[PDB]
Design a binder for this molecule. Structure first.
Ligand SMILES: O=C1c2ccccc2C(=O)c2c1cc(S(=O)(=O)O)c(O)c2O
Ligand SMILES: O=C1c2ccccc2C(=O)c2c1cc(S(=O)(=O)O)c(O)c2O
Ligand SMILES: O=C1c2ccccc2C(=O)c2c1cc(S(=O)(=O)O)c(O)c2O
Ligand SMILES: O=C1c2ccccc2C(=O)c2c1cc(S(=O)(=O)O)c(O)c2O
Ligand SMILES: [Mn+2]
Ligand SMILES: [Mn+2]
Ligand SMILES: [Mn+2]
Ligand SMILES: [Mn+2]
Lengths: 223, 222
C-alpha cells in the first residue's frame, strides 16, 4: 500500500461554466466525507438488481454554489440549472481565500489519510480544482490529501464480477436498474457516486488504498 | 423593519444527547442557506393538498456529525441513530475551535443580514448552540447573525388560512404526506425548508418582522 489505508473517502463533484477548452470555472462544489468503517458497514448487495444502498448514517456534507468570473456556456446553464447572472443576484461569492479556509476546516474534521473520489476526476474535477486553488493567496488545503478516479475503480470492479459506457449514469443504471436522482447537480452527482461505490464496498476500498495518489501531483487544467 | 430585510435564510437543525434538563450536547448540525430571492421564486402552492415544493436550485448546505463529550441517552440513540461510541470510532471531532472557524467561513459566504430559522429554536436549538459556542476560546461566529423560531411563524401563517406544531404534524397537515428522515439534522432541515416554502412571501415577511440578534439568546445552561 503506497500511503497506507485511507481513513476517509471524500466523494467530490463539481459543476462548471463549460468544457476544458473554454478554461472553465467552478459554479458548484460538493464534498461528502465518509469514514472507511461507514463504507465497509454497508450490507452486501444481494438480488439482481440489488436495492440502491442506504447512505451511511454518519456523514459530513458540504455543498456550495460559487459565482464564476465568466458566463456559463448555454450547455452548462441548461443542464446544471446554474448561471452567472442568477448566482450573482443570489449573492454567491467567487472561488476565494475564504472558500479555501472553509475547505481546510472541513478537511480537518476528517481522520487522515483522506482520499478524494471523483468520477472522471483525473481529466476534469482534479485538474480544475487545482487550477482554482492555484489562483488563491492561501496555500492549497488539499496538499496532504490523496485522490482517485472512480471510472478506473468501477472498470476494475465490474471486470472482476463478470463494450460498456462508464458515464456516471450508465454505471448507476446498470448496477441498480434505476435512473440517477438530480443529475448534473454537484450534490446529486456525489450521491449517485456514493451509491455506486457502495456496490462492492470492501473491493472499492482496497482499490482506493492501492491507487490513491497525492493531490499535489495533479496538474492544473490551465494556468 | 427592525434590522432591515434578511438577505439570507439559514434553515438549521440539531441532534443531541438528550432533553434540556440533561445539559445536552450537539451530535449533528445542518445549515441550509437560501437567498431570499430563491424563496420568493418557489411557485405559489395550488391544490389541496399542494405538491411538496421543489427545493431552490441555488443552495449552500453544511451537515456535520459531532462527537459529544457525554453519552447519548437511550432515547436519543434510538431515534437519531447516533451514539458517542459510533461517532468516536468514525473519528468525529468534538464541538471545538476549528468547528467555529468552519461555521464562520460558511456564514461569510452568505449576503447579510442573515437569519437562522429553526423549529422550536427559541427553546432548544438556539440556547443549546449558544451554550456550545460559549465554551470555545474563539468568539461566536453567530454574533452578527439574526434568528427566528418557525413554530410561531407557521402558527401565524396557518391561523390565517387544537393543532400539533411538531415539525412532522405541520408538514403532514400542509402536504398530506409523512416527512422523510425524521430526527436527522439534514432530514429535519429539508422538512422545515418545505414547510417554509408553503407561503414564501408571508414567511419572509414574518421573518423580517421577528428577526432578533442571536447574541440575545440566553444559553441553555452555563
Ligand atoms: O463535458 C462536461 C463535463 C464533464 C465532466 C465533468 C463536468 C463537466 C461540465 O461541467 C461541463 C461539460 C460540458 C459543458 S458544454 O457541453 O456546455 O460545453 C458544460 O457547460 C459543462 O459545465
Ligand atoms: O458531460 C457533462 C455535461 C455536458 C454538457 C453540459 C453539462 C454537463 C455537466 O454538468 C456534467 C457532465 C459530466 C459530469 S461527469 O462525467 O464528471 O459525471 C458532471 O458531473 C457534470 O456536472
Ligand atoms: O427533546 C429532545 C430534542 C429536542 C430538540 C432537538 C433534539 C432533541 C434530541 O436529540 C433529543 C431530545 C430528547 C431525548 S430523551 O427523551 O431520550 O431524554 C433525546 O434522547 C434526544 O436525542
Ligand atoms: O423531541 C425530540 C427527540 C426526543 C427523543 C429522542 C430524539 C429526539 C430528536 O432527535 C428530536 C426531537 C425534537 C426535534 S424538534 O422539536 O426541533 O423537531 C428534533 O429536531 C429532533 O431531532
Ligand atoms: Mn462530475
Ligand atoms: Mn456533476
Ligand atoms: Mn429540531
Ligand atoms: Mn432534528
Amino acid at each position: 500500500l503506497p500511503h497506507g489505508h485511507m481513513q476517509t473517502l471524500i466523494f467530490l463533484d463539481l459543476e462548471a461554466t463549460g468544457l476544458p477548452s473554454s478554461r472553465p470555472e467552478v459554479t458548484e462544489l460538493c464534498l461528502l466525507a465518509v469514514h472507511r468503517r461507514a463504507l465497509e458497514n454497508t450490507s452486501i448487495s444481494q438480488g439482481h438488481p440489488p436495492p440502491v444502498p442506504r447512505p451511511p448514517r454518519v456523514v459530513d456534507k458540504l455543498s456550495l454554489c460559487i459565482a464564476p468570473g465568466k458566463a456559463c456556456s448555454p450547455g452548462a446553464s441548461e443542464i446544471t440549472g446554474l448561471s452567472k447572472a442568477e448566482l450573482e443576484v443570489q449573492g454567491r461569492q467567487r472561488f476565494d481565500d475564504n472558500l479555501a479556509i472553509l475547505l481546510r476546516a472541513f478537511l480537518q474534521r476528517q481522520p487522515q489519510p483522506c482520499c478524494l473520489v471523483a468520477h472522471n476526476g483525473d481529466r476534469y474535477d482534479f485538474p480544475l480544482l487545482q487550477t482554482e486553488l492555484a489562483r488563491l493567496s492561501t496555500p492549497s488545503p488539499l496538499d496532504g490529501t490523496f485522490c482517485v478516479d472512480s471510472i478506473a475503480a468501477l472498470k476494475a470492479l465490474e471486470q472482476a464480477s463478470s463494450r460498456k459506457s462508464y458515464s456516471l449514469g450508465s454505471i448507476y443504471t446498470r448496477l441498480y436498474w434505476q435512473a440517477p436522482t438530480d443529475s448534473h447537480t454537484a450534490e446529486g452527482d456525489v450521491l449517485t457516486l456514493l451509491s455506486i461505490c457502495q456496490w462492492k464496498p470492501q473491493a472499492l476500498l482496497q482499490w482506493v488504498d492501492e491507487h490513491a495518489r497525492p493531490f499535489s501531483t495533479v496538474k492544473p487544467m490551465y494556468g
